[PDB]
Amino acid sequence: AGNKYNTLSNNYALSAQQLLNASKIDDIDSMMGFERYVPPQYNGRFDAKDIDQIPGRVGWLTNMHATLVSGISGVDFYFLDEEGGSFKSTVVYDPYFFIACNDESRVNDVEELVKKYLESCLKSLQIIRKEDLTMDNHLLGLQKTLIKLSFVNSNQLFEARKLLRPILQDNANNDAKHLIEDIREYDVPYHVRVSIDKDIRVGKWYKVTQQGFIEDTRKIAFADPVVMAFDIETTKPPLKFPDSAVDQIMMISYMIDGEGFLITNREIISEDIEDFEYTPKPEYPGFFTIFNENDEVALLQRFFEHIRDVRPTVISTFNGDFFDWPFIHNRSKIHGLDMFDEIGFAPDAEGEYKSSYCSHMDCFRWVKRDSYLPQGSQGLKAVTQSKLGYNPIELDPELMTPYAFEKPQHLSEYSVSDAVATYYLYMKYVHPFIFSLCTIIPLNPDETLRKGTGTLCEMLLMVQAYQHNILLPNKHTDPIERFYDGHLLESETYVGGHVESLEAGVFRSDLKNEFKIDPSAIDELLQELPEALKFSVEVENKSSVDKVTNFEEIKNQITQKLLELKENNIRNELPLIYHVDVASMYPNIMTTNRLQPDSIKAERDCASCDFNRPGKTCARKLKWAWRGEFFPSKMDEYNMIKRALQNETFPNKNKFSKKKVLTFDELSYADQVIHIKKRLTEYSRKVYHRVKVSEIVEREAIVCQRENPFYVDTVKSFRDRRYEFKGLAKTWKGNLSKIDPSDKHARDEAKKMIVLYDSLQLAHKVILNSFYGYVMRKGSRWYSMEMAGITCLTGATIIQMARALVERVGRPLELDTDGIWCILPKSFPETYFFTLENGKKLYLSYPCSMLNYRVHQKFTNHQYQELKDPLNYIYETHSENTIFFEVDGPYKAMILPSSKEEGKGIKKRYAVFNEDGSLAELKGFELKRRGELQLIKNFQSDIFKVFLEGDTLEGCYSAVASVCNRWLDVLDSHGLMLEDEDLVSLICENRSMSKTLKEYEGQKSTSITTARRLGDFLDKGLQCKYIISSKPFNAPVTERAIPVAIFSADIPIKRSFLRRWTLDPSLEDLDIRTIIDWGYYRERLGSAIQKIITIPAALQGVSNPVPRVEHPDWLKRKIATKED
Amino acid sequence: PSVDIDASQWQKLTQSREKQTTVITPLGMMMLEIQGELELPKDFASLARRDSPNEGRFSEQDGETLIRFGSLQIDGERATLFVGKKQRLLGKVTKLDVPMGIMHFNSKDNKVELVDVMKYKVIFKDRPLPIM
C-alpha cells in the first residue's frame, strides 16, 4: 500500500505533451494550407440524396491521422478536396473496448464491479450484443452479451487495460472478479476504429457534415494532388559509404507535377550548371531549372522554402526512408535547422519519415511488396528498365565525388535522371495502386504502402465483421511449446503446394516429339465429350446450348481428331507447348468449399449445434496433411533436460534490473523453452544421431456450411467486383479505340480512368490472393492453420488429377502448384468457336474445358448452404464450384534443366519463348541479379535468344552449343584476346555489402576480403568488384579475392599489394592474365553450361552437344544404364 | 550569328544517281558503333615503321600512317569484323529508324556542307572473341 498517487500525474503530463504536439501539427498544417474547417450548423432533415442542399463542404479524403483535441481523441482528415487546394476537418469519437462474461445471468454484478474499479479512467459504460461465431447456436440469432467500456482518449483506454490484465492473469492461473472471462477488441488502432465505425476511406470522396462524413459516388476519378519526387547526391570517401556526420549533400534533384528542378552546392560542385532537358522518352518530359546555391545550408534552406511554396501533399523518393531523409535531417541538425519546424517531417517509431499534411511515398516499398520484381531487379535502374522501359543514366558511386569537381554537368545529368525515374515510377505505378487500395482499406497512404499484405487482409476482414455486427477475435498467440507422441515439437505445419519436374530438355513447336497416347483416356474423353461441350456453353460461357447453331459441328470435328489419336496412339509429330493454370486457385478452392476460420468446427461444437440432426448435409468433411518436426527425445528425456537447467544460472536480460543473475524458474517461459530447445538439440544429436524427425499425418476436419457467411461473402463479392472491373476495363478498351483520334479532345480523362479500373482490378487481385495467404499469418486474427492445409491438399489433388489426364494424352514437363506445363500432339483438338443465333462467337479451348468438366464432376460442393430468409433462419442447399483452368499459349519453345543427381529433375526453373521469339517467362537463372560474375551475365544474354534457332531439338541444342564453345574458347585461350580492361570487367565479380561497420568486423570471406583489401589499399552498401587470383595455390577462394582497382593503380603500389596478396615476394610479372585463376572461371562457366544446356539435352536422352563440358558421374551412369 | 547548310552537291548527286542498294552508299560511306572504348596506341609515326614488311599491319599512304585494324565480311544481314590478331566481333546490318546525316563545318569560310545521309548501321553488341 504505497504508490497510488504517482500514476495519475504521469497520464495528465502525457496528455498535455500530446496536446502540445497536436498544436505544433495544427500550426504546420495551417502553414501548408490545411486550415481546420468547421461546417455550418444545419437543423434540416438529413438525407444523402439531397447532398447539394446538405451543408458544409464536399471533399476527397487524401490524408488521415489520429490527434488529441482541446485532451479528447479525434482524427484529422485532409481533403485534397475538389476545387480547393485543401482543407482539414476533425471527427471526435470515444475510444472503446469490450468485457466478456462467463455467466450472462450476472452481467449486472460485473457492471457494478467495473464501474467502481475503473472510476479513475472510464468515461461511460453500456451493455451491448454482438454475434460471436465461437458461441454455440449463434446461427439461431443468439448474441454474446458484452460490456462496452468507452474512454475520453486512448491513454485512459490503455490504463483500463493495465488495471484489468492482472485480474485476467489471476483468473487464468488460480466473486464478480471471476465472472470476467476476457477483454475483446482492445487492440484496434484508434484511427482504424474511426475509419471503420464511420466508413471513411482515403481515396474515397466524402461530404464533411455535423453528423459525420457522407460518402460521394458522383465522383470516381481521383483529384490531382501536388506531387513532388526527389533524390540526393552526397560526397563519399573512396570505397566507403557517405557518412552524414562528415559528408555533405552535393545536389538535390526533384520533379514537381512534371517540371524538373536541381539545387547544387557550390562548395562541392565546381561550375554553375545551366538549365537543361532530360527527356528519356517523349512520354517522360523533364525540363530542369537550376538553383546554384553557395553552400550546403543555402541548398537545404532553398529545398525547405520550395516545399513550403508548392505545398506537396505527396513527396516520393526511392529508398528515402533509409538514406535521403536520414541524411537531410542529420545535415540540417549539424547546421542547426529543425526539419520538423521547417517542413513538418520527422522520423516515426519505426525510423520512417512522415508528416501530417503530406504522405511520404517511398517507391522502394512498393518495389519490394507489389511490383512482382525479383530482389535482383529491385534497384532503381532495373525497376526503370523493367517498368518505364528505358535505361536511366548510370554513374559509378566512386566517380560521383571526383565528378563534382572534374565533370559536374555529367553528375547533374545523372542526378536528374534518378529524379525523372522516381517521379514517373511513382505516377505510372505507385500513385494509382496505393490510392485505389485506400478506397477500400481503412488506412492512410503511408500505412497502405508500408504494412504487410496480411495486415491489409486483416483490415478488410475487420470492416466486414464490423458491418455484420460480428465480435472480433483476439490475436492468435502461438503456444510456446507443443508435444506430439511425447516428443517436443520444434515446428508444425501442413503439406503445401505440389510441385513436380517430370522432364528436362529443349521442346520446340518446330521439332518433333514422340507421343504414346493411352487409348482408354481417349475412350473416357469421347464418352465425356457431349457433357464437356455442354458445360463449356452453360458454365464457362454462361449461355444456353439451345442458342448455339454449330454445336454438333464442333462436336463432330473434336470426335474425328480424338478417334484418329485413338487408332494412331503412337505418333512422332510436332508439339503444342501449353500452360494450363487454375484461375486464382486457392481463393476458388476456398469459395467452392465455403472455407473460412469461422467454420472449422470440432466434433463438440458440431454436437452442440441445433442443426445437427439425422440426415444432416451441412457438415462437409475435408482432409488435410499435417506435418510435424519434433525432437527424437521423449517426455522423460525432456524432463531430465529441464531438471538439469534448473541447476544452471542465467544472465538477466533486463538492463533496468540491479539483479544480474536469474535461476531457470525466474526466466520467462519463452526463455526457459529457448534454453530447453538448445540442450535438446545437443542431446538428440548425441543419443539419436539426428536433431529432428519429420512425420506427415493425414487429418480430417468439419467445414460447417450453415455457419454465418461473412468471410466467404467477402471473397465471393470481392471476386465479382474484380471480374466487374476486368469487364469495365474491356468496355473502356473498346471506348479508347472506337472514337476519333484527336488525342487532346477531353478524352485523356477517359484513359486515366482506364488505368484506374485496371488498378482497382489489380487491387482486388492482390487482396484476394492475400486473403489466401493471411490465413496462415502467425499472430494475425482469424488465423486458421487447418483451413490452410485443406486448401493446399485439395489443390494438390486437383493438379495431380489434371496431370494424370495430361500424361495419358500428351507429356507434362513441369508442374508448379496450380500450373502444368505440357506438350500435346499438334493433331490434338485445340481452339474452336461456338456461333450463337445472334452471330456472337463463344470461345472453346478443348484442352481447358476437358479439365474443367472433370474438376466440376469431382470437386463440386453439393453441400453449400446459403441463408435465404434471415428472419426464419431458412437455408437453401445448392451446388457451388468456381475452380477453372485457364490456358496460355501455344508457345514456340520451352527449356527445362536437369540435376547432377540420378533420376532427379530441377523444379521451378525454366525459360519459355513466344511465337515471335520474345522471352515470355523465365525461372531461376542469374544475370537479372545485382552483381554476380559478368562473364556469366554476358553468356546468359547471348544464350537465351539462340534457343529460338534450329528446326529440331538436336538442331536447337547444336546452335546453342556453338555459342557455348565460343565462350569456352575465350577462357581456354586465357582471354589473351580482346582488351585488358574488358577482360577485367567480364571476369569481374561484383558483390554489395549491406552495412559494413561491426557486421564486418564480424564474418570474413571473399567480399569481406575485397572490402578489407580496399581498406588496406585506398560503411553501408560498398560494391566489392574483384577477381580470383591463381596464387596462393591450395588457398580458399575467399583469400584469393583481389579488388580490380589494384590493376589501375601505380606500378609500385600494384607490385607491393599483389606480392602481399598472392604470398609471392618474387612476383615481377603484373599482367592481369598471369594473376587470374582461369581454372576457377572455367568451372563457373562449365557449371552454367551444365545447368542450362548439357543437362536439358542429356536429361531428355539426346547426345551431349558441348563435349568440352562433361556430364556429372551420376548422369553418365544414368545414360549408360538407359542405353544398355 | 547565322550560317546556311550547303546541301546542293549532295542533292544533285542523289538525284542523278540510283537509290541506295547495299549498306554502302554510292559515294562510299559507312558508320560503326562499338559498345566500348577502342584502345589504340598514343603515337603512330614511330610505331608504323617498326612493323615488319610481311604483315603490313601499319601501312603508310600519302604521308599518313594508317593502321590496318581489321577486316569486314558481310554475309547478308550478318556481319563480322576481325580486329588485330586476337579479336572477332559479330554484328548486324540494321536499317536506321531515323536516317542519320553527316555534315561538315568549314570554320575557315563559315560554310556548312552536307556530306551524306545514312540509312544503315553495323552494330556489334557482344563481347569480342578471338579470331578463330
Binding site: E274 | Q35, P128
Partner: peptide, 26 residues
Amino acid sequence: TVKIWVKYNEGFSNAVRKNVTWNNLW
C-alpha cells in the same frame, strides 16, 4: 604491334541530352 583491342562496356548507355552553343560546334 598486337596491342589493339576493345575494352568492353557491359551495357549500352546513352547520355543526357545537352543544349548546343555556337562554341560547341566550333
